[PDB]
Design a protein around this ligand. Structure first.
Ligand code: SF4
Ligand SMILES: [Mg+2]
Ligand SMILES: [Mg+2]
Ligand SMILES: [Mg+2]
Ligand SMILES: [Mg+2]
Ligand SMILES: [Mg+2]
Ligand SMILES: [Mg+2]
Ligand SMILES: [Mg+2]
Ligand SMILES: [Mg+2]
Ligand SMILES: [Mg+2]
Ligand SMILES: [Mg+2]
Ligand SMILES: [Mg+2]
Ligand SMILES: [Mg+2]
Ligand SMILES: [Mg+2]
Ligand SMILES: [Mg+2]
Ligand SMILES: [Mg+2]
Ligand SMILES: [Mg+2]
Ligand SMILES: [Mg+2]
Ligand SMILES: [Mg+2]
Ligand SMILES: [Mg+2]
Ligand SMILES: [Mg+2]
Ligand SMILES: [Mg+2]
Ligand SMILES: [Mg+2]
Ligand SMILES: [Mg+2]
Ligand SMILES: [Mg+2]
Ligand SMILES: [Mg+2]
Ligand SMILES: [Mg+2]
Ligand SMILES: [Mg+2]
Ligand SMILES: [Mg+2]
Ligand SMILES: [Mg+2]
Ligand SMILES: [Mg+2]
Ligand SMILES: [Mg+2]
Ligand SMILES: [Mg+2]
Ligand SMILES: [Mg+2]
Ligand SMILES: [Mg+2]
Ligand SMILES: [Mg+2]
Ligand SMILES: [Mg+2]
Ligand SMILES: [Mg+2]
Ligand SMILES: [Mg+2]
Ligand SMILES: [Mg+2]
Ligand SMILES: [Mg+2]
Ligand SMILES: [Mg+2]
Ligand SMILES: [Mg+2]
Ligand SMILES: [Mg+2]
Ligand SMILES: [Mg+2]
Ligand SMILES: [Mg+2]
Ligand SMILES: [Mg+2]
Ligand SMILES: [Mg+2]
Ligand SMILES: [Mg+2]
Ligand SMILES: [Mg+2]
Ligand SMILES: [Mg+2]
Ligand SMILES: [Mg+2]
Ligand SMILES: [Mg+2]
Ligand SMILES: [Mg+2]
Ligand SMILES: [Mg+2]
Ligand SMILES: [Mg+2]
Ligand SMILES: [Mg+2]
Ligand SMILES: [Mg+2]
Ligand SMILES: [Mg+2]
Ligand SMILES: [Mg+2]
Ligand SMILES: [Mg+2]
Ligand SMILES: [Mg+2]
Ligand SMILES: [Mg+2]
Ligand SMILES: [Mg+2]
Ligand SMILES: [Mg+2]
Ligand SMILES: [Mg+2]
Ligand SMILES: [Mg+2]
Ligand SMILES: [Mg+2]
Ligand SMILES: [Mg+2]
Ligand SMILES: [Mg+2]
Ligand SMILES: [Mg+2]
Ligand SMILES: [Mg+2]
Ligand SMILES: [Mg+2]
Ligand SMILES: [Mg+2]
Ligand SMILES: [Mg+2]
Ligand SMILES: [Mg+2]
Ligand SMILES: [Mg+2]
Ligand SMILES: [Mg+2]
Ligand SMILES: [Mg+2]
Ligand SMILES: [Mg+2]
Ligand SMILES: [Mg+2]
Ligand SMILES: [Mg+2]
Ligand SMILES: [Mg+2]
Ligand SMILES: [Mg+2]
Ligand SMILES: [Mg+2]
Ligand SMILES: [Mg+2]
Lengths: 231, 137, 148, 208
RNA sequence: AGCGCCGGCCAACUCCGUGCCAGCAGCCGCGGUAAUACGGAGGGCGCGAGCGUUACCCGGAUUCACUGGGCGUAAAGGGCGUGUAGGCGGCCUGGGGCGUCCCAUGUGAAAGACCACGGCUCAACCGUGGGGGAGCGUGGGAUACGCUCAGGCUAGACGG
RNA sequence: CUGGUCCACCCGUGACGCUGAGGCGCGAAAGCGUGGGGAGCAAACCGGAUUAGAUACCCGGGUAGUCCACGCCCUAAACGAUGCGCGCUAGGUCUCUGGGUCUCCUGGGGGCCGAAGCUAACGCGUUAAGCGCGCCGCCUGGGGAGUACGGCCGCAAGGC
């Protein structure tokens, strides 16, 4: 699936706010902006995907991590596609290291489903139907992708390892592999399966997350093709 | 620059602690014989007589362990520890009977004898002593 | 299962208006006497809780020490802060020559013959910590050759 | 000289039975059978955790009290073992088990090491024919510990050798009963004697 | 059969007496009317013809740190240059072989220390036998490093 | 009139180097000597307030001194409380000053934030407090005390 027309989609960005450990994935600086060795992207992407399919083919789940407003909606698109958990809003410290306890929070969301389903005493004073529905909508805003996760993942897919350094910090604390899409402002050594590429253009994020899902769905039996993408 | 031998050991140590593929040291026949042993014992991949700006150097190719899993990916070193022993301020010489055993055996002591630069194991075989240059593990 | 040994139980205090209010700290080492040992420090508002909480982290922080006939392979020296620990291999009829703190860690990891020495600050916490990192860096003739 | 006072209080203190009398040690009248708690006003009070120093001291006193030997002679035997070759622990027990009064006890000549001492001390024992009244005599492999001929017609040694006619001894020993004489074959192992004593703790006591 | 000790360090706890008194005390500290810390008693711990005390030496004290420490704020960078002695010093080659390394040889008394055996009934004590070493004299040998002598070089330094 | 220093050229010399016990020179202010000068300011001093008092803070006066020449004194929170030299170990940003080809690159300074690492922590971090070599100075519990005695220096104060 490893398209080579990613050059039309990103070839990296970000001038000199770089991280000198990312020098091994740079070709030069065009406008004074750091531009990525797409071949280095290619080679890593192949090794990166070789890990992903292997994990799908064994029924392993992959928690997708993206909060920056660019990747935020599309990590919801592509992870709902793959039927696999995401976190698009505020990342919650301890979503891995304190999983059992944040997982005590989705249980509460679960019971507000079987409560606001009906009809279990709507004879609660109108303060309550107003209050719990607020809590419900709130719980829904942050846990809509995490509730799908019922146990420590086997990998996490991050779109900015600098932005999501907390999640990387938890997953590494738990020996969980970390695949990610990094550009020049990120620390490579902290990620296990690298995708060196622009992580600010929705262009790049879509071409990487969707093709990542395409490997996920195909390695779970029965393929499918084009999926959403705003112009 | 008062001690080229300690400058080379330190160039390596500063290079290995940041995980360089290589680092260049100013060249000399005594230095090569010292690197000759670091290769023949696996502390380095080896070296090559390169030149920089017209000056003879020694490009030493470093070697590390497998990447690690956890909060610290950085891999274990192969030269955990290398330090000068005999110095310009205090020459150190041992006879064959007093040659020390670096790290119970897992480490090498590098000596200069009148049969050439030798490890402590080599030196005990040939039965000679000399100036205790350094120790590595 | 794992044998536990309390090493340190101290009471710290903190000040407020109205007076001081305490808290307890538990230094616990766990091990099997076969090559597996862990150290954890536990703090809680009462002694038994902190003791139990310390046993918990001790299992979440272990180290396999390459026992060889009941001694360590090579001598090692580690500094943790201002505390320094020295360990030296020793033959069968030796024993475990160590202060109370490092003795507990070596004993539960199966070490039966070792010479040790504390130097620098003898703070039990930092000494216990320095003994773990010393065991953690012990290496066999195998790993030596594996690296080269 | 040796400790000569009440001997059941030792067992009650050490928390184990030390067979310091022979006969009553197996009866229901044994102190550890009736009051298995330390002597004195506070014996029946709840014990608090002993310090590491207490532990090692208790083990050392347990080992020492077993032989009824002085701390001086005890420590000297230990120091010899520490300077001796190999493992101090084994050698210590070995040199302990090589005392004449101890071998005389092991051979069933006497029901207690105290009795053995008074037997040796009163000269009722010989070593390789040669009479020896020294409790601290060191027996060596190949020796022979016999009852004195001018004492063979003694009630106490008679009843005791009666009760030994087919009783085993340590592998390192033999006993020709009826002839009233045995042999010291070899210096024992720790395996050959399951004394209720971890000896390493005694090493650690003296290493402070 | 006695002597020390039983607040923590440090092994061994209770009752009375006393009430910041009398007293204890190696350090930290005990005593102001329920003192495991003073005094006695019962009990307990430790040793035993000894047990404690005082003095002194080494240890613990990597607390003069060669092994094996330090100096921004803990004790500790000289107020700053300049420079004498001294300490230390770059790349390549050859001579010498002072240091250094190796071999041989002489010396390294006896006693003591150590390993084995043996003699006093054991031990102490004692006898017999066993293995060395550093260091220094001598002869022989090595030359990487340091030194010295000689010849080159330009990366230090100095000058145009 | 004169010192240091940086840059470009890579032209000359050929390790001529680093450090530096002693020595010698420099050394803020206050102070001293001889002479001059004296507006402002201002120890001492006098007076008014303030205040319970106010030998102070505040106010009105005011002499040394502050200024110049020459000669002494030689101290300091003389501080970055951080000796000098060399080599090595991510970067980002502001700035002074040179040379490019002037996008930027590259030297030499001066700051800030930080990689690895160090540190008891605070913090340091290519201007190290990192990793190493050389050499010098210095510390070894608080007080007594930078005191006494001695010696050397000073006109004295007083310094070492
Ligand atoms: S009777 Fe029991 S308590 Fe008394 S000496 Fe014998 S074994 Fe010990
Ligand atoms: Mg980005
Ligand atoms: Mg040395
Ligand atoms: Mg291991
Ligand atoms: Mg410490
Ligand atoms: Mg330190
Ligand atoms: Mg060994
Ligand atoms: Mg200390
Ligand atoms: Mg202390
Ligand atoms: Mg028995
Ligand atoms: Mg124990
Ligand atoms: Mg031994
Ligand atoms: Mg008779
Ligand atoms: Mg028994
Ligand atoms: Mg001792
Ligand atoms: Mg005593
Ligand atoms: Mg009290
Ligand atoms: Mg004691
Ligand atoms: Mg006690
Ligand atoms: Mg009175
Ligand atoms: Mg009372
Ligand atoms: Mg007392
Ligand atoms: Mg009392
Ligand atoms: Mg006696
Ligand atoms: Mg005496
Ligand atoms: Mg002393
Ligand atoms: Mg000392
Ligand atoms: Mg030193
Ligand atoms: Mg110190
Ligand atoms: Mg200075
Ligand atoms: Mg001074
Ligand atoms: Mg010289
Ligand atoms: Mg040289
Ligand atoms: Mg030469
Ligand atoms: Mg030559
Ligand atoms: Mg020579
Ligand atoms: Mg000799
Ligand atoms: Mg002799
Ligand atoms: Mg004999
Ligand atoms: Mg010797
Ligand atoms: Mg010679
Ligand atoms: Mg020359
Ligand atoms: Mg030059
Ligand atoms: Mg020039
Ligand atoms: Mg030129
Ligand atoms: Mg020339
Ligand atoms: Mg100078
Ligand atoms: Mg000077
Ligand atoms: Mg001046
Ligand atoms: Mg002035
Ligand atoms: Mg003046
Ligand atoms: Mg005056
Ligand atoms: Mg005057
Ligand atoms: Mg004047
Ligand atoms: Mg005058
Ligand atoms: Mg005047
Ligand atoms: Mg005037
Ligand atoms: Mg006035
Ligand atoms: Mg007034
Ligand atoms: Mg008045
Ligand atoms: Mg006034
Ligand atoms: Mg005024
Ligand atoms: Mg005025
Ligand atoms: Mg005046
Ligand atoms: Mg005047
Ligand atoms: Mg001066
Ligand atoms: Mg300043
Ligand atoms: Mg400066
Ligand atoms: Mg100063
Ligand atoms: Mg100070
Ligand atoms: Mg200096
Ligand atoms: Mg220094
Ligand atoms: Mg510039
Ligand atoms: Mg310009
Ligand atoms: Mg700069
Ligand atoms: Mg900073
Ligand atoms: Mg860091
Ligand atoms: Mg340091
Ligand atoms: Mg910088
Ligand atoms: Mg650099
Ligand atoms: Mg600078
Ligand atoms: Mg420092
Ligand atoms: Mg003092
Ligand atoms: Mg003075
Ligand atoms: Mg003064
Ligand atoms: Mg004077």
């Amino acid at each position: 699936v490893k398209e080579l027309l990613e050059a039309g989609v990103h070839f990296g960005h970000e001038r000199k706010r770089w991280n000198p450990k990312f020098a091994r994935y740079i070709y030069a600086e065009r406008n004074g902006i750091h531009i990525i060795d797409l071949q280095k992207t290619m080679e890593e992407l192949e090794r990166t995907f070789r890990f992903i399919e292997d994990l799908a083919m064994r029924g392993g789940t992959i928690l997708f991590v993206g909060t920056k407003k660019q990747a935020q909606d599309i990590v919801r698109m592509e992870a709902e596609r793959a039927g696999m958990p995401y976190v698009n809003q505020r990342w919650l410290g301890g979503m891995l290291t304190n999983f059992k306890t944040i997982s005590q929070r989705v249980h509460r969301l679960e019971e507000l489903e079987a409560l606001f389903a009906s009809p279990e005493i709507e004879e609660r004073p109108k303060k309550e139907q107003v209050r719990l529905k607020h809590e419900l909508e709130r719980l829904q805003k942050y846990l809509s992708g995490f509730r799908l996760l019922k146990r420590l993942p086997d990998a996490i897919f991050v779109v900015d390892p600098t932005k999501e350094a907390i999640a990387v910090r938890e997953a590494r604390k738990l020996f969980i592999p970390v695949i990610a899409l990094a550009d020049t402002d990120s620390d490579p050594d902290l990620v296990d399966y690298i995708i060196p590429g622009n992580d600010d253009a929705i262009r790049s994020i879509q071409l990487i997350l969707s093709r990542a899902v395409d490997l996920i769905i195909q390695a779970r039996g029965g393929v499918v093709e084009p999926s959403p993408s705003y112009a | 620059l008062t001690d080229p031998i300690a400058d080379m050991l330190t160039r390596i140590r500063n290079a290995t602690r940041v995980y360089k593929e290589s680092t260049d040291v100013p060249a000399s026949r005594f230095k090569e014989e010292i690197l000759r042993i670091l290769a023949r014992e696996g502390f380095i991949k080896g070296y090559e007589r390169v030149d920089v700006d017209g000056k003879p150097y020694l490009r030493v190719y470093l070697k590390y362990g497998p990447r690690r899993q956890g909060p610290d990916p950085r891999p274990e070193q192969v030269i955990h520890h290398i330090r000068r022993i005999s110095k310009p301020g205090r020459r150190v010489y041992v006879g064959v009977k007093e040659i020390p055993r670096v790290r119970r055996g897992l480490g090498i002591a590098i000596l200069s004898t009148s049969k050439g630069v030798l490890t402590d194991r080599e030196a005990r075989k040939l039965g000679v002593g000399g100036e205790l240059i350094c120790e590595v593990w | 299962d794992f044998e536990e040994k309390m090493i340190l139980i101290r009471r710290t205090a903190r000040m407020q208006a109205g007076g001081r209010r305490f808290r307890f700290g538990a230094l616990v080492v766990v091990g099997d006497r076969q090559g597996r040992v862990g150290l954890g420090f536990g703090k809680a508002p009462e002694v038994p809780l902190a003791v139990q909480k310390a046993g918990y982290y001790a299992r979440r922080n272990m180290v396999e020490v390459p026992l060889q006939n009941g001694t360590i392979p090579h001598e090692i020296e580690v500094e943790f802060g201002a505390s320094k620990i020295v360990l030296k291999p020793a033959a069968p009829g030796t024993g475990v020559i160590a202060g109370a703190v490092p003795r507990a860690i070596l004993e539960l990891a199966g070490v039966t013959d070792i010479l040790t020495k504390e130097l620098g600050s003898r703070n039990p916490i930092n000494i216990a910590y320095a003994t773990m990192e010393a065991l953690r860096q012990l290496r066999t003739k195998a790993d030596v050759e594996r690296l080269r | 000289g040796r400790y000569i006072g009440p001997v059941c209080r030792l067992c009650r203190r050490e928390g184990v039975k030390l067979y310091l009398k022979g006969e009553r040690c197996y009866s229901p009248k044994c102190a550890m059978e009736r009051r298995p708690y330390p002597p004195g006003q506070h014996g029946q009070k709840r014990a608090r955790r002993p310090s590491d120093y207490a532990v090692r001291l208790r083990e050392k006193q347990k080992l020492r009290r077993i032989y009824g030997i002085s701390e001086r002679q005890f420590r000297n035997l230990f120091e010899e073992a520490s300077k001796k070759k190999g493992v101090t622990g084994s050698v210590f027990l070995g040199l302990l088990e090589s005392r004449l009064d101890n071998v005389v006890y092991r051979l069933g000549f006497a029901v207690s090491r105290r009795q053995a001492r008074q037997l040796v001390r009163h000269g009722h024992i010989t070593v390789n024919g040669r009479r020896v009244d020294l409790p601290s005599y060191r027996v060596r492999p190949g020796d022979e510990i016999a009852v004195a001929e001018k004492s063979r017609n003694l009630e106490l040694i008679r009843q005791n050798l009666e009760a030994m006619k087919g009783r085993k001894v340590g592998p390192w020993l033999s006993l020709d009963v009826e002839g009233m004489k045995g042999k010291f074959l070899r210096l024992p192992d720790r395996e050959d004697l399951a004394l209720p004593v971890n000896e390493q703790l005694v090493i650690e006591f003296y290493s402070r």
